Write a protein that binds this ligand. Sequence first.
Ligand SMILES: Cc1cc(-c2nc3cnc(C4CCOCC4)cc3n2[C@@H](C)c2ccccc2)nn(C)c1=O
Length: 108
Amino acid sequence: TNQLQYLQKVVLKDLWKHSFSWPFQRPVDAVKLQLPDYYTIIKNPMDLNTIKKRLENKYYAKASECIEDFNTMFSNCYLYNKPGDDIVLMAQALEKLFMQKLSQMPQE
Ligand SMILES: Cc1cc(-c2nc3cnc(C4CCOCC4)cc3n2[C@@H](C)c2ccccc2)nn(C)c1=O
């Protein structure tokens, strides 16, 4: 659980504390945001709270399964949203930090 512990205690913590993480802290609320196509276009949604619960509940078999979920979260944001949107600028800044935290992760 070495790399899964670093994903929880360093990567997830430092993304959560970033000022732009708030849109990713819960699943997209399609009702309150009136985005009725979101869950049709995004078949495999993901968000930081789902990742937080999976790490707390030891749902992941391996670190790479948790990395796939962060990557899906970012990919979904770029797929659904438009290049000039606030949320895309926010995702890009959070993903840059993500890639730095992975570069500093110790080996298993
Ligand atoms: C991953 C993701 C997340 C959000 C999303 N969560 C929000 C939660 N709350 C508010 C607001 C609701 C009203 O109170 C203020 C926050 C806005 C929210 N958005 C959008 C509309 C948004 C974010 C940042 C900037 C601008 C728009 N929207 N899509 C399309 C995504 O792909």
